[PDB]
Each structure stands twice: as structure tokens, then as C-alpha cells.
Design an enzyme around this catalytic site. Structure first.
Site, short mmCIF file in Angstrom:
data_model
loop_
_atom_site.label_atom_id
_atom_site.label_comp_id
_atom_site.label_asym_id
_atom_site.label_seq_id
_atom_site.Cartn_x
_atom_site.Cartn_y
_atom_site.Cartn_z
N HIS A 61 46.87 -14.37 42.08
CA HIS A 61 47.13 -13.17 41.58
C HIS A 61 47.18 -13.22 39.94
O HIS A 61 47.26 -12.20 39.42
CB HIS A 61 48.63 -12.61 41.89
CG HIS A 61 49.80 -13.37 41.84
ND1 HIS A 61 50.08 -14.23 42.79
CD2 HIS A 61 50.69 -13.87 40.70
CE1 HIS A 61 51.20 -14.85 42.50
NE2 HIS A 61 51.46 -14.53 41.63
N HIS A 91 51.60 -17.13 31.98
CA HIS A 91 50.48 -16.30 32.66
C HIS A 91 50.19 -14.98 31.98
O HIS A 91 50.97 -14.77 30.97
CB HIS A 91 50.84 -16.25 34.00
CG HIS A 91 52.04 -15.33 34.22
ND1 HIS A 91 53.38 -15.85 34.34
CD2 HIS A 91 51.95 -14.00 34.34
CE1 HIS A 91 54.10 -14.76 34.75
NE2 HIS A 91 53.42 -13.70 34.54
N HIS A 93 48.65 -10.68 32.68
CA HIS A 93 48.18 -9.70 33.36
C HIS A 93 47.15 -8.86 32.36
O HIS A 93 47.09 -8.82 31.09
CB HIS A 93 49.34 -8.56 33.27
CG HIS A 93 50.58 -9.31 34.28
ND1 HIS A 93 50.58 -9.36 35.51
CD2 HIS A 93 51.66 -10.06 33.48
CE1 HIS A 93 51.75 -10.08 35.94
NE2 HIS A 93 52.24 -10.51 34.75
N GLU A 103 51.64 -4.44 31.33
CA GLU A 103 52.75 -3.99 32.23
C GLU A 103 53.70 -3.42 31.48
O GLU A 103 53.89 -1.85 31.84
CB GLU A 103 53.39 -5.35 32.57
CG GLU A 103 52.32 -6.36 33.47
CD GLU A 103 53.06 -6.93 34.63
OE1 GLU A 103 54.10 -7.68 34.31
OE2 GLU A 103 52.60 -6.73 35.75
N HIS A 116 52.96 -13.53 29.57
CA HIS A 116 54.48 -13.86 29.78
C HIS A 116 54.61 -15.46 29.87
O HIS A 116 54.04 -15.97 30.54
CB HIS A 116 54.77 -13.25 31.13
CG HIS A 116 54.78 -11.86 31.17
ND1 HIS A 116 54.48 -11.09 32.66
CD2 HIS A 116 54.77 -10.84 30.47
CE1 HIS A 116 54.46 -9.84 32.41
NE2 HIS A 116 54.68 -9.68 31.08
N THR A 195 57.90 -9.15 37.94
CA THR A 195 56.95 -7.92 37.94
C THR A 195 56.28 -8.20 39.26
O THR A 195 55.23 -7.19 39.53
CB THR A 195 56.52 -7.58 36.70
OG1 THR A 195 55.29 -8.73 36.47
CG2 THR A 195 57.31 -7.42 35.39
N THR A 196 56.31 -9.34 39.99
CA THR A 196 55.51 -9.43 41.02
C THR A 196 56.64 -9.96 42.18
O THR A 196 57.43 -10.44 41.70
CB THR A 196 54.58 -10.72 41.00
OG1 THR A 196 55.25 -12.01 40.71
CG2 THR A 196 53.37 -10.71 39.89
HG HG Z 1 49.85 -14.60 45.07
ZN ZN Z 2 54.01 -11.64 34.39
#
Ligand code: HG
Ligand code: ZN
Ligand code: HG
Length: 256
Positions: A61, A91, A93, A103, A116, A195-196
């Protein structure tokens, strides 16, 4: 399982993670006219001189750069925090186009990407314990706009080739996270969540006001990653962002 497509996308997460419709979900739109200047908020304390990066991995992801958090080597303190938070990983996004990807939004404006830096509260002892508490995590959010190249990000851009598909990892030593910070440390803060999935509501968000700029070619390499594992039908790792959630009962404070 969960992902970012039309069939397993953010709009579907609630089925497997009901907290998705909780009271302190992230991300949110930062309304700048409504944010409250809080003079009791202290300056952020970012001590990353002793950071030890270990590896980079494509977890299906995003890609995480992992750090050694067995000691107080890279920590976050001050701001609206209480105590010491140790960096575990960072990581990003990003979007399919430069007009989306972040985000959090500012007055509804969307950035090309969002970084993040994930930290956990050391009185809880381990990351796993930290996610079950209301003040368990601290995430430093940094927006990326497309412009000039960011020198400090190229080392990350160059290894992406090596971890193209889900489950691949590569040694990623001596990376200094300092090269990713903007000049100013002015920020906005509010209580939110991951957020995930599992979307646990254990996060203190710290969103910096000033974006860092990256070149078109740097963001391009992010878009070359795959959500799929090796030997599977290729699915570009793009638009791995969750849309803004209702603020509900919360106040967004500003350090400036
Ligand atoms: Hg994943
Ligand atoms: Zn994040
Ligand atoms: Hg929590």
C-alpha cells in the site's frame, strides 16, 4: 483485502473496520480561518541527528523506510506532545496526477504528495502497545508540491527499482531524515487516527505549514511502484490516499 481500488477502497473500509466512521478519523481539511492560534503550544523538538535507518519495504500500500527504535535515537518532543516519541518509520501518499495525492488538505487545496513520519510514545514500551492508547502515536505530516528537486529525497528515489512489488525489501542504511524537513517548523495539530486500516484513533497529528518541493521526475518514480506482488498482474501504486473525514467535535490548533 482492503486497498485503494473501486472495490476495496476507502468507501468500503467501514465493513471490516467500523471505526472508519468514528469521531476522530483522519485525514481532515484544515480550514485556516477557523484554526485557533494557541500561544501555550511549544515549539516542536525534532532530534534526528542519531537516526538509524535500516531498510525500505513495499508493503503493498506504500513503501516504508524503517528505523531502529530500540533506543531513543530519533525522537520528537514538544509541540502539543507530552514526553518522548521515537521514530519507527516514514512513508508517503501520492496521486496519479500532480493535482492530488495528499491526505490532509489546506482550505481544500490538495498537494501532490504527503509524507508521514510515524512516532510512538515511549511510556508504552512498544509500537504494538502504543496503538491502543489515546496519546500513543505522533505523526508529523509534510506536504510535497512539484517544483525544484529535493536533494535529500534522491537516495529514496534511486532504491525504488529494487522494491517494485509487494513484499520486497532492501537494506537502506545511513539515510538522514533531516533532508526531508522544510525550513520552518510552524504547524497545525489535532487529535486523529491512522489513515489506513486499522484506523485506530491513537494519533496526535502535527501537520507542517510549509511544504517541501520535489521535481516532476522524483514523483514520477513513486508512480512506478506496484500494489501487486511479483508475478501478478501489474497495478500501479497510485492514489494511495484517503479523502478528508468530518472534523466533528474537534478543534484544530495552530502554533502560529
Ligand atoms: Hg497493505
Ligand atoms: Zn500515512
Ligand atoms: Hg487509541
Amino acid at each position: 483485502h482492503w486497498g485503494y481500488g473501486k472495490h476495496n477502497g476507502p468507501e468500503h473500509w467501514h465493513k471490516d473496520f467500523p471505526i472508519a466512521k468514528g469521531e476522530r478519523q483522519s485525514p481532515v481539511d484544515i480550514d485556516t480561518h477557523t484554526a485557533k492560534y494557541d500561544p501555550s503550544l511549544k515549539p516542536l523538538s525534532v532530534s534526528y541527528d542519531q537516526a538509524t535507518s535500516l531498510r525500505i519495504l513495499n508493503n503493498g500500500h506504500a513503501f516504508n523506510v524503517e528505523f531502529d527504535d530500540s533506543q531513543d535515537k530519533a525522537v520528537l518532543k514538544g509541540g502539543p506532545l507530552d514526553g518522548t516519541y521515537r521514530l519507527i518509520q516514514f512513508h508517503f501518499h501520492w496521486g496519479s496526477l500532480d493535482g492530488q495525492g495528499s491526505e490532509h488538505t489546506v482550505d481544500k487545496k490538495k498537494y501532490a504528495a504527503e509524507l508521514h513520519l510515524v512516532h510512538w510514545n515511549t511510556k508504552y514500551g512498544d509500537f504494538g502497545k502504543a496503538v491502543q492508547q489515546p496519546d500513543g502515536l505522533a505523526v508529523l505530516g509534510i506536504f510535497l508540491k512539484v517544483g525544484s528537486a529535493k536533494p535529500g529525497l534522491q537516495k529514496v528515489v534511486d532504491v525504488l527499482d529494487s522494491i517494485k512489488t509487494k513484499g520486497k525489501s532492501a537494506d537502506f542504511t545511513n539515510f538522514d531524515p533531516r533532508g526531508l524537513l522544510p525550513e520552518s517548523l510552524d504547524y497545525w495539530t489535532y487529535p486523529g487516527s491512522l489513515t489506513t486500516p486499522p484506523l485506530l484513533e491513537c494519533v496526535t497529528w502535527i501537520v507542517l505549514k510549509e511544504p517541501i518541493s520535489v521535481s516532476s521526475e522524483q514523483v514520477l518514480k513513486f508512480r512506478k511502484l506496484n500494489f501487486n506482488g511479483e508475478g501478478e498482474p501489474e497495478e500501479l501504486m497510485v492514489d494511495n490516499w484517503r479523502p478528508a473525514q468530518p472534523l466533528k467535535n474537534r478543534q484544530i490548533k495552530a502554533s502560529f
